[PDB]
A paper describes a structure:
Nicotinamide phosphoribosyltransferase (NAMPT) plays an important role in the biosynthesis of nicotinamide adenine dinucleotide (NAD+) via the nicotinamide (NAM) salvage pathway. Here, we demonstrated the NAMPT-mediated salvage pathway is functional in the Gram-negative phytopathogenic bacterium Xanthomonas campestris pv. campestris (Xcc) for the synthesis of NAD+, and the enzyme activity of NAMPT in this bacterium is significantly higher than that of human NAMPT in vitro. Our structural analyses of Xcc NAMPT, both in isolation and in complex with either the substrate NAM or the product nicotinamide mononucleotide (NMN), uncovered significant details of substrate recognition.
To gain insights into the functional significance of the tunnel in NAMPT catalysis, we introduced mutations to amino acids within the internal cavity of the tunnel and investigated their impact on enzyme activity. To completely block the tunnel, which had a large diameter, we made multiple substitutions using bulky aromatic residues simultaneously. Specifically, blocking the tunnel caused a 129-fold increase in Km and a 3.35-fold decrease in kcat for the substrate NAM, resulting in a 403-fold decrease in catalytic efficiency. Consistent with the positively cooperative model and the existence of two NAM binding sites, the hill coefficient of the quadruple mutant dropped to 1.00, indicating a loss of positive cooperativity after blocking the tunnel. Our ITC results also supported these findings, as the affinity between the quadruple mutant and NAM was undetectable, indicating a significant reduction in NAM binding at the catalytic site without binding at the tunnel location.
Numbering used by the authors:
A (entry chain B): 1 to 227, 258 to 274, 278 to 395, 406 to 432, 435 to 468
B (entry chain A): 1 to 394, 406 to 431, 435 to 468
Write the structure that this text describes.
């Protein structure tokens, strides 16, 4: 934990010597962050707040410069000792950058400006590029939140078709079990938090801690206890029904027994357990005309991904069973099987000021922002010189400037913005 | 950082309530960790030491029990306050387990015991199950160390065939630059170190920090300065020569390595248009090694294409193997590199007559991020529990260890009751009851891994 407490060493090695590459007379730089495309056409922005709280949690000190100058020397990189000491002494160790971003939770289509980073000091103009490495890692919470959100839209579709209470049923249909299948503890926390943007169920306790620490939400999610959750193979409802009357506390305690298989094809086993359970406890028909099992539910934790989950939901509703009957769990397929290429996540330089003049660097160019249309709500990237010309708002807000986080969200605010977005 | 400082909450939610599901009269549990196949047939064991140093860094406190009791109650899971308060009171907050593992760096064939966790107390027999979630995440440093190692064996082959100094050329052939394409800071550090088991090149500074903090290696890796393509452009189309000229002015010192970026078509232009014919100055005059990194073209072709273009611009010498080695310049390919594409490049350029010395690789997301727990089908399984003083079994069953054959050096899993001769127990007790009994320097880790071949 404490051995990583040096912001000056939280970058790519070649960044320590990057300021020497600028043309003479540079005094400002402007960067933006976009998803160039990939699996989905829209991304739920989330995570930057957690990143800034943890990666930039205190002013840079002279001890930071001392330790970094030593290592980077031995490591093989020139290090701007003058510029960093100037930041500690002149700017009080507060990074001279301004970060604007779309509110965390908003779902924005790809190829659009999600963040902008701009230097606020002429001497330390190079600080944005230095911070590119740790800021670009916002791809991960963004990408996980998008996955959990895209899955939410699949279940919302089927609940709306087959459930008498879709929006009540929905927040408990995806549980994150990915703590063991993720690359590190911090990734479990942050990534697990990205899932909590869309659902209330998670077994990643580390997501609870980060949500409370970085988003002011004490108990952001709930979980499943087992021993009512019970494990099975699919062929034990097959057995215990007609090779018996284990209707012992199931009907007597009146509890909701969640039957979870762990073997078989994710689509077939779910339909099998539904049918078997229907022949063991009966069912009732809701207002939509779909059957809802009595007491028993099915939980599928194995083999769930967005495509296999849609397959399951298609099969069971065509059989006449409401989406209320099942719930899903995703583990590694939610927190680990994603990368920066999944949504083609980039941080691009768009503008530098050289000799008092801004010049374009080149997909998008110049000093940019995100606009939201007042009537339709649709998004489009545009230049800062275009916020004046009125049936449009600047969709970004300054969240961080010169050491002070200017805008914070609660996880409930984030959940609100994600839940309003559909499709 | 500090908000995670509670071991009691570093697990799956249902694992906090797992002690309720043992039979009555249980007084011991025994678990093992294996890779049950996957992409590769062998895995380089690494990372467990860092995991234990960071995840278990202090005794369990009563405050920890207070917070975990409160949260798990609101969250919806039973929490064994009784067992944990007894551990803090009686066992001084020291986890009553013993962890044995193969020495970090060893490359072990899949389907073999790599770790064993056993309880050392009759009351707190369930502690291993509780620690399963954090321990199983050893899949990540094992998988990344294996990936870097499998790539090393590929480069070793073509260096052995085409280079006059293979083992000297090898440790700088794969640079990890994936600090930006990894899921978090902690994964960057631990993952970057897993790659440092096999190579000396990295831009992941956080790997240096973890290697210094958890593996007693002060400066475990080295880097060179490299030209960013966005920054060169800012100089303007007019002063584009002057950008590279300054690039050499800052970093191109005699024994130094400097990396510049261009495309397939600029090197083509520079040669037969003479626009930068003045630019062979202080590439040659500096005596530095200028790495040319492409940003356009097919990842396999641009390597050979740059080699040929550079072969004209700077000439070459023919080594003892008969393979050409460019003067001053080298090629660095960081885009699209994976074990199979890297093998493709080396196949192409050597068949063209160029020694593997000419090229060097960087991997980003494909090394630190494009891996999962299924990559090596990594498992943690209970194999034995003691019930009423009697051990009962739960691929493998019973209480297990790893054996290495004295003559061949081959590995096989076996029962503890079977160390009866001409084989040594390949495991060592690294952690027991709060004490880390064995630690390794990264160089000790590097030594074990470098000896394994194929």
């Amino acid at each position: 934990m404490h051995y990583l407490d040096n912001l000056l060493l939280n970058t790519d090695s070649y960044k320590a010597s990057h300021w020497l590459q600028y043309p003479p007379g540079t005094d400002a730089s402007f960067f933006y962050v976009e998803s160039r495309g990939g699996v989905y056409d829209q991304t739920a922005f989330f995570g930057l707040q957690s990143i800034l709280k943890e990666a930039i949690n205190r002013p840079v000190t002279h001890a930071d410069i001392d330790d970094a100058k030593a290592l980077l020397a031995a490591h093989g990189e020139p290090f701007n000792e003058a510029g960093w000491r100037d930041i500690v002494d002149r700017l009080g160790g507060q990074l001279p950058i301004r970060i604007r971003a779309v509110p965390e939770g908003c779902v924005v289509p790809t190829h659009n400006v999600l963040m902008t980073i701009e230097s606020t000091d002429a001497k330390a103009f190079w600080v944005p590029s230095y911070l590119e490495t740790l800021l670009l890692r916002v791809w991960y919470p963004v990408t996980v939140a998008t996955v959990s959100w895209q899955v939410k839209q699949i279940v919302r579709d089927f609940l709306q078709r087959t459930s008498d209470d879709p929006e009540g049923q929905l927040p408990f249909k995806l549980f994150d079990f990915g703590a063991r299948g993720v690359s590190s503890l911090g990734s479990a926390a942050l990534g697990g938090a990205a899932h909590l943007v869309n659902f209330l169920g998670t077994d990643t306790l580390s997501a609870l801690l980060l949500a409370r620490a970085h988003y002011h939400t004490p108990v952001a999610g709930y979980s499943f206890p087992a021993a009512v959750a019970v494990v099975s193979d699919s062929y034990d409802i097959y057995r215990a029904i007609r090779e018996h009357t284990l209707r012992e506390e199931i009907i007597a305690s009146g509890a909701t027994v969640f039957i979870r298989p762990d073997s078989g094809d994710p689509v077939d086993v779910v339909e099998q357990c539904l049918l078997l359970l229907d022949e063991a406890f009966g069912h009732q028909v809701n207002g939509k005309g779909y059957k809802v099992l009595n007491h028993v539910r099915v939980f599928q934790g194995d083999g769930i991904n967005p495509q296999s989950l849609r397959a399951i939901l298609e099969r069971i509703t065509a059989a006449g069973y409401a989406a209320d009957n099942v719930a899903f769990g995703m583990g590694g397929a939610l927190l680990q099987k994603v990368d920066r290429d999944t949504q083609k996540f980039a941080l691009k330089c768009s503008a530098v000021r050289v000799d008092g003049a801004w010049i374009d660097v080149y997909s998008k160019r110049g000093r940019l922002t995100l606009l939201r249309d007042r009537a339709t709500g649709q998004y489009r990237s545009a230049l800062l010189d275009e916020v004046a010309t009125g049936d449009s708002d600047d969709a970004l807000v300054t969240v961080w400037e010169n050491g002070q986080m200017l805008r914070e969200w609660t996880l409930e605010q984030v959940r609100a913005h994600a839940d309003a977005a559909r499709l």
